[PDB]
From a paper:
The bifunctional l-fucokinase/GDP-β-l-fucose pyrophosphorylase ([name]) from [name] catalyzes the conversion from l-fucose to GDP-β-l-fucose. The full-length [name] ([name]-FL, 949 amino acids) exists as a tetramer in solution, but the individually prepared N-terminal domain ([name]-NTD corresponding to the sequence 1–496, also containing a SUMO tag) and C-terminal domain ([name]-CTD, the sequence 519–949) form a monomer and a dimer, respectively. [name]-NTD has a single α/β domain and a β-helix-containing domain, whereas [name]-CTD folds into two α/β domains and the linker comprises three α-helices.
Numbering used by the authors: 571 to 812, 831 to 949
The structure:
């Protein structure tokens, strides 16, 4: 659809949007094009805050000048966009601002997606009221596998939706995020944005077809929030930088098995199935388990029910399901006394009961 961005905020106000990251428990890759277009995808994932905060944040502000100012705190970068030719220049070399550019474009600041036709960006945001100033914060080393890219895209889209009064619900935010992924030619799946924007634990399912709008079924969060099991979920930043159809059918069926185990509240089965998801991911691709990750895994595999890397991974973050709190203390001991990198450390993850949230000052 075409959008009509209208300044829905006061001139002395800032829109703050923020989203947790996402850990996929099972079914990942079945959401990734093109296999999702044949059998459909089943993905059990979950929204998590890191160290008690939503990691993916966006500030949107009115700007005195009649242009667009993109800033990045985690990279300390800045860029000025004043024409449609610059805004739609998504892969400007050296610009880490492809995501907010595409998001502003989808919000009606590009000629194709704006319902009202304008001639220049200056006139467009002069009728809009003033310029726009977007400041991003993604305090996560890239290549984490935590859905950072797509969830940050959804966060920018929701911040702009609140900033312009577009009245998008979370589902349409995720759908426009899929459109944005198609704009930047990332070819990415749809698991990440639904895992991050929507609160709690979810099973996501699609049918065959090019239209990939996932059906969402929430799961109880007992195995993640109850004090019996809460301290058994460990997330470890490792300091690492970065015929098949039968296997993907097996991955769909395994996502359904994980859904069953979570419904029934079986913690041991849940951990074993996380381990099986790790085995499936290793079977699918060669570069899933770099040698440093396996070196870490060998130190603590005897105290876990299962483990995996979030998303594509390739290193960085490692999710582990300890057998019990005593085993969790043992794992923290081992990985603190045998750090595979000086930057390796544990990250406290909590289930997000909020998902994407947005407020004003
Ligand atoms: C298993 C794979 O994980 C990716 O997540 P990231 O590693 O990019 O955070 C998703 O973008 C893919 O769609 C796929 O589900």
């Amino acid at each position: 659809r075409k959008s009509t961005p209208k300044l829905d905020v006061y001139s002395d106000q800032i829109v703050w949007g923020r989203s947790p990251v996402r850990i996929d428990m099972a079914g990942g890759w079945t959401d990734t094009p093109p296999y999702s277009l044949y059998s459909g995808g089943n993905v059990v994932n979950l929204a998590i805050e890191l160290n008690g905060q939503p990691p993916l944040q966006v500030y949107v502000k009115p700007c005195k000048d009649f242009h667009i100012v993109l800033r990045s705190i985690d990279m300390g970068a800045m860029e000025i966009v004043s024409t449609f030719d610059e805004l739609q220049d998504y892969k400007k070399i050296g610009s880490p601002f492809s995501i907010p550019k595409a998001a502003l474009s989808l919000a009606g600041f590009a000629p194709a997606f704006s319902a009202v036709s304008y001639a220049s960006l200056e006139e467009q945001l002069k009728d809009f009221g003033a310029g726009i100033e977007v400041t991003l914060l993604a305090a996560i080393p890239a290549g984490s596998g935590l859905g950072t890219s797509s969830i940050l895209a959804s966060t920018v889209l929701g911040a702009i939706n609140d900033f312009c009064g577009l009245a998008w619900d979370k589902n349409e935010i995720c759908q426009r995020t899929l459109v944005l992924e198609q704009l930047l030619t990332t070819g990415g799946g749809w698991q990440d944005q639904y895992g991050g924007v929507l609160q709690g634990v979810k099973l996501l399912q699609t049918e065959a077809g090019f239209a990939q709008s996932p059906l969402v079924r929430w799961l109880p969060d007992h195995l993640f929030t109850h004090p019996e099991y809460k301290d058994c979920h460990l997330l470890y930043y490792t300091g690492i930088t970065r015929l098949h159809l039968n296997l993907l059918s097996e991955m769909k069926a395994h996502a359904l098995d994980m859904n069953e185990a979570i419904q029934r509240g079986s913690f041991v089965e849940f951990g074993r199935l996380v381990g099986k998801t790790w085995e499936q991911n290793k079977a699918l691709d060669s570069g899933t388990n770099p040698p440093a990750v396996e070196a870490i895994i060998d130190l603590i595999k005897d105290y876990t029910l299962g483990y995996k890397l979030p998303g594509a991974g390739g290193g960085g973050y490692l999710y582990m399901v300890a057998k019990d709190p005593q085993a969790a203390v043992r794992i923290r001991k081992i990985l603190t006394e045998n750090a595979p990198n000086p930057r390796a450390r544990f990250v406290e993850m909590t289930l997000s009961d909020k998902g994407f949230q947005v407020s004003r000052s």
